[PDB]
Amino acid sequence: ALCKFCDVRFSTCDNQKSCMSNCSITSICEKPQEVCVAVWRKNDENITLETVCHDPKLPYHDFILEDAASPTCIMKEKKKPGETFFMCSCSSDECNDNIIFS
Q: Member of which family?
């Protein structure tokens, strides 16, 4: 897969059904089994969006990417203290460039 791969960046994504990553780095994932991932995080100081390639047989941020076969990145909330944490994964080109909350 080709994925957005900006790692963690500041984001203005908030209060809307979907957001573009605004990441200008598209990479070919190193291994064929890797999928695209996005992580949206809001704490009391800022909002960030993380975009990477990742092998779904390996945990990421201590979670398994259960949705890796999906073609779209549908954000789901994870239990994390101190912040609001949403993650999605997907296996179509640049699919982590469009993160969907609805």
A: Belongs to the protein kinase superfamily. TKL Ser/Thr protein kinase family. TGFB receptor subfamily.
